[PDB]
């Protein structure tokens, strides 16, 4: 059939600039001067939505900053100017042949200045200690870029076991990143230790940010 | 208003068989064709199969051939898709779309989505615990609170603050698989004036187990 390959796989464009994403088809989808293509935008946790049909046309209700062009086997998607709400995963679809297929996908992100994370660590609840478990959870919010590291230190000793890290997608309005780290340990390990330290290593800080508490 | 409804999520063991429902409304069910789309996180979107509801004629992908079976109910205006022997690669979010034909055919409307997780584990109701700092150095004018949801299968789980009263400064973190059980956390950032005056509660609802847990912070 017709295989669609989009390049690149991920793109970061600053606000006010232009974002160009190409959809390359293995075979020509153009039939009778009218090419077969559809551009889809999909946000995380939502179904995709149509944007550009026939590669030359904008759908009613879709803002005018979204546009596309190209003929034959090479199509492009041009978004200018780029806005904070434009961050999402983009797709392309060919109706020319059967079976119809979808593109490999491209994730557009907003580029801006770097930001330092806000580190807050929460001791385990008394309800969890009743069941016999304990979880020391540490929150890191509003940091850019997404490259960051979290180090757990109990009583001055680093413990990498029992750590659950979860990263989010880029915030629409803030264009920042957020993550958490959960250190799970038994109540016996909770009563036999006092100091619980959460450290954050980010490109905006030469030294790790220390946020801790005492039992 | 044309709308396509689907169940929230479905749990299945490897080698079993499930039947997914796609309910069409707002337009005649027999005048359009029903298509199915597979989305695995990080893989992107994939095409499954398309069925003509009038004659129940099916067109399936070679990858999904003999894996999927399509059938429709014209009296209930609802389309069905049967999946046989799902594997670990078959765990994904499934969609049903109405294909709108004007010359080139696009997809105008989509379903709510269904997350089918392939595992041998049994549904575990969530255990929700509040997270409060209990101490601080008074170095910040903002008060951050959190909520921990652990020991639940399968995903996802809806977590709101004060039954959705706070739509700002809230962050819902995705689940993490540990020891066959999913775990997520949540956070909310309110100013130092809101914390003593307003009560912050954690509203958690698990769609798979149909359970709701409320914990005050």
Numbering used by the authors:
A (entry chain E): 1 to 215
B (entry chain D): 1 to 217
Paste lines from the article.
The S protein is a single-span transmembrane protein that protrudes from the surface of SARS-CoV-2 virions to engage the host receptor, human angiotensin-converting enzyme 2 (ACE2). The ectodomain of the S protein consists of a receptor-binding subunit termed S1 and a membrane-fusion subunit termed S2. The S protein of SARS-CoV-2 forms homotrimers on the virion surface and likely exists in two major states, namely the “closed” state with three RBD down (receptor-inaccessible) and the “open” state with one RBD up (receptor-accessible). By using a combination of biochemical, virological, and cryo-EM structural analyses, we identify three types of cross-variant neutralizing MAbs, represented by S5D2, S5G2, and S3H3, respectively, and further define their epitopes.
S3H3 binds a previously unreported epitope located within the evolutionarily stable SD1 region and is able to near equally neutralize all of the variants tested. Mutations occurring in the SARS-CoV-2 B.1.1.7, B.1.351, B.1.617.1, and B.1.617.2 variant S proteins relative to the WT S are not present in the S3H3-SD1 interaction interface. S3H3 does not block ACE2 binding to S trimer. Our structural analysis showed that S3H3 binding tightens the B.1.351 S trimer with its RBD-1 in a transition state between “open” and “closed” configuration, inferring that S3H3 may inhibit viral entry by locking the fusion machinery in the prefusion state and/or by affecting RBM exposure to cellular ACE2 receptor.
